[PDB]
C-alpha cells in the first residue's frame, strides 16, 4: 500500500534506481532509500518541492524532474547533492533559480533548462544568467527568455530591474 519491500508503492525500484515517473504524482514520494543513485520523477504533476526533500539523498547521481509544473525552487534544495552530475528540469514552470542554488553541485556535467518561462525582465534571473555564462558547456538545449526568445545566457544587469518582479 505504501511500500512494496523498501520501494515506495507508487514507484518501481531496481538496484539503486527508483523510478517514480509517469505515475500522475503530485508530490515526491516518501521513503526513498538512502542508497538511491538514480531517481526518476519525470512526467508527473509535481507543483512544488518541500525544503530539504533531497537532503538525505547524498548518493544521487542523476535527478530527472522534467515534465512537471514546478513554479519555483526552495533555497538549498540541491546543496547536499555533491555527487550530482545530471539535473534535468526542462518543461516546467520555472521563472528563475534561487541565488546560489547550484553552488554545491561540483560534480554537475549536464543540466537541462529549456522550455521554461524564464522571466528575464525581473532581476531575479541574474543568478542563472551569470551561472550560464560561467558554465556554458553543461546546458543541453538553450534556456530562453520568455516572450523575446533571447537566451538566458545573454542577460545583462542593464536589461533587468527589481520593479518588474511580480
Amino acid at each position: 500500500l505504501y511500500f512494496q519491500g523498501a520501494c515506495p508503492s507508487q514507484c518501481s525500484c531496481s538496484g539503486t534506481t527508483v523510478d517514480c515517473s509517469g505515475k500522475s504524482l503530485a508530490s515526491v514520494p516518501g521513503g526513498i532509500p538512502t542508497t538511491t543513485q538514480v531517481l526518476y520523477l519525470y512526467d508527473n504533476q509535481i507543483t512544488k518541492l518541500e525544503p530539504g526533500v533531497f537532503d538525505r539523498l547524498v548518493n544521487l547521481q542523476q535527478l530527472w524532474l522534467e515534465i512537471n509544473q514546478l513554479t519555483s525552487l526552495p533555497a538549498g534544495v540541491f546543496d547536499n547533492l555533491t555527487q550530482l552530475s545530471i539535473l534535468n528540469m526542462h518543461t516546467n514552470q520555472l521563472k528563475s533559480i534561487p541565488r546560489g542554488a547550484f553552488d554545491n553541485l561540483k560534480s554537475l556535467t549536464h543540466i537541462w533548462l529549456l522550455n521554461n518561462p524564464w522571466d528575464c525582465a525581473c532581476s531575479d534571473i541574474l543568478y542563472l544568467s551569470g551561472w550560464l555564462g560561467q558554465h556554458a558547456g553543461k546546458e543541453q538545449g538553450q534556456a530562453v527568455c520568455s516572450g523575446t526568445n533571447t537566451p538566458v545566457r545573454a542577460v545583462t544587469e542593464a536589461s533587468t530591474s527589481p520593479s518588474k518582479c511580480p
Partner: protein, 441 residues
C-alpha cells in the same frame, strides 16, 4: 531458518520467539508473522546500521521496551502493523532521530499515542501511518511543531468523532503532502451539532497537497459546513470519493444534490484536481462547481447522474479532463457542455445515451479525447464530429449502431477517413462489420 539474500533477511513465519543471530551487515530485515512476545535493547544488538525493519502481525500483545532501537542510526522505515494490543513503553522509540517512516496500523492504539510522548524522539519523521486503530480524537502534542519534515499522516479507519481547530493546534504552520482522513465517519459533525462554532477551522494556517476525505458519508449539508469551516485552506487535490450520502440519487432519498453553495469555502483553495466518484449524485445543478476556478481534472464517474442542468460547469475555464463514466445520462445536447472551452478529455462511456444533439460538442474546440463507448447509440447526426479538429482518440464500440444507408453514410465515411483515431472499432449490430468499412451507394 531465515532466507538471507544479499542485504535482505526474510524471516516471515519461521516460528521465531526472539530476534535470531544473523549477519551484522544486512540493511533490510522482515520479521513479520512470528511469535515474538517482547523486543528489548538486546533484540537488535548485532543488526546495527539497518535501514528497513518489519515486525508485523506477531502473536497478540507484542511489547516494545525502552531503548529497543537505540543505535539503529541508519533506520529510515519501521513497520509494526497488525500487532493486536501493542504495548509501547514511553522510550520505545528512543534513538530514532533519523527515522522518516513509521507505520502502526491496526495496533488497537488510541488518541494518547499522539498526545503522549511516544513520538517525541522522532524529530526527522516524515510519514506516520496510524490506519485502523481506536483514535477517537486527533490531538498532536506540541513537539510535532519541531518535526520539521512531517508531511504525511494517514488516519483512515479510525473512529474519529470530529476534527476541530484546537485538536489540530500542533499541526498549524505545516504543509502536508498527504493528509488521509478516509472512512472516519465524523459522526458528531451533522447539521444539528452544537459544536460547529467552537470547532473553528481544523486546518487553520495549514496547506495540503492531497486531502483524502473519502468514505465519510458527506451529506450535502455536511460538506457545506465543513468547507465553510476550512475556508481558505490551500488544497491541490481533493478526494471525496465514496461519499455515499452526498448525491440525492435515482429515486426517493432523503439527501440533497450539491448546489452552488456546497463547495463555496474552497473558492480560494486553488484546487487543481477533484475526485467525486462513486457517490450518489443525481443532478448537476447550476454553478455547483463554480468555486473550482483552478480545477484541471474533475471526475464524476460511477455516480447516479441522470440530469445535467444548464451552466453546471460554469467557471471551469481551465478544466482539461472531465470523467462522467458509469452514470445514467439519457441524451446529450449542445447546452450541457457549455463553459468548457479548454476541455481536452471527455469520458462519457458506460452511460445510457441514446441521442446526440446536433451541436453536442460545439464548444470544445480543443478536445483531444472523447469516449462514448458502451451506450445505446444507434445513429449520429451528420457532421457531429466535423469541428473537433484537434481530436486524437474516440471510442464508439459496443453500441447497437444502425448501419442502414444513407443514414450511416456520414459516420461510415467519417470513421474511414479518420481511421487512425478510432479506439476499439465501432461495429454494426447484426453483421458485425466495422462501421469504417461501409460505403453507402
Amino acid at each position: 531458518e531465515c532466507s538471507v539474500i544479499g542485504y535482505n533477511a526474510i524471516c516471515i513465519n519461521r516460528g521465531l520467539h526472539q530476534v535470531p543471530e544473523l549477519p551484522a551487515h544486512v540493511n533490510y530485515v522482515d520479521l513479520s508473522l512470528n511469535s515474538i512476545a517482547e523486543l528489548n535493547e538486546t533484540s537488535f544488538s548485532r543488526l546495527q546500521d539497518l535501514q528497513f525493519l518489519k515486525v508485523e502481525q506477531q502473536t497478540p500483545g507484542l511489547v516494545i521496551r525502552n531503548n529497543t532501537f537505540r543505535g539503529l542510526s541508519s533506520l529510515i522505515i519501521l513497520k509494526l502493523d497488525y500487532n493486536q494490543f501493542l504495548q509501547l513503553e514511553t522510550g520505545a522509540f528512543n534513538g530514532l532521530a533519523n527515522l522518516e517512516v513509521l507505520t502502526l496500523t491496526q495496533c488497537n492504539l488510541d488518541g494518547a499515542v499522539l498526545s503522549g510522548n511516544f513520538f517525541k524522539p522522532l524529530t526527522s519523521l516524515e510519514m506516520l501511518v496510524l490506519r485502523d486503530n481506536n483514535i477517537k480524537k486527533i490531538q498532536p502534542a506540541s513537539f510535532f511543531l519541531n518535526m520539521r519534515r512531517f508531511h504525511v499522516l494517514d488516519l483512515t479507519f479510525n473512529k474519529v468523532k470530529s476534527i476541530c481547530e484546537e485538536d489540530l493546534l500542533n499541526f498549524q504552520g505545516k504543509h502536508f503532502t498527504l493528509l488521509r482522513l478516509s472512512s472516519i465517519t465524523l459522526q458528531d459533525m451533522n447539521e444539528y451539532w452544537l459544536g460547529w462554532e467552537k470547532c473553528g477551522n481544523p486546518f487553520k494556517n495549514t496547506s495540503i497537497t492531497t486531502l483524502d476525505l473519502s468514505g465519510n458519508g458527506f451529506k450535502e449539508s455536511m460538506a457545506k459546513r465543513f468547507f465553510d469551516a476550512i475556508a481558505g485552506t490551500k488544497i491541490q487535490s481533493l478526494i471525496l470519493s465514496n461519499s455515499y450520502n452526498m448525491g440525492s440519487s435515482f429515486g426517493h432519498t432523503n439527501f440533497k444534490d450539491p448546489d452552488n453553495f456546497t463547495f463555496k469555502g474552497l473558492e480560494a483553495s486553488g484546487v487543481k484536481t477533484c475526485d467525486l466518484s462513486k457517490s450518489k449524485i443525481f443532478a448537476l445543478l447550476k454553478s455547483v462547481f463554480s468555486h473550482f476556478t483552478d480545477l484541471e481534472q474533475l471526475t464524476l464517474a460511477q455516480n447516479e447522474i441522470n440530469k445535467i442542468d444548464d451552466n453546471a460547469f460554469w467557471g471551469l475555464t481551465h478544466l482539461l479532463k472531465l470523467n462522467l463514466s458509469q452514470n445514467f445520462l439519457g441524451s446529450i445536447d449542445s447546452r450541457m457542455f457549455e463553459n468548457l472551452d479548454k476541455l481536452e478529455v471527455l469520458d462519457l462511456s458506460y452511460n445510457h445515451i441514446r441521442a446526440l444533439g446536433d451541436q453536442s460538442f460545439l464548444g470544445l474546440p480543443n478536445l483531444k479525447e472523447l469516449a462514448l463507448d458502451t451506450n445505446q447509440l444507434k445513429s449520429v447526426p451528420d457532421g457531429i464530429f466535423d469541428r473537433l479538429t484537434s481530436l486524437q482518440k474516440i471510442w464508439l464500440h459496443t453500441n447497437p449502431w444502425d448501419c442502414s444507408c444513407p443514414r450511416i453514410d456520414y459516420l461510415s465515411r467519417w470513421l474511414n477517413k479518420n481511421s487512425q483515431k478510432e479506439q476499439g472499432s465501432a461495429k454494426c449490430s447484426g453483421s458485425g462489420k466495422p462501421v469504417r468499412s461501409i460505403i453507402c451507394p
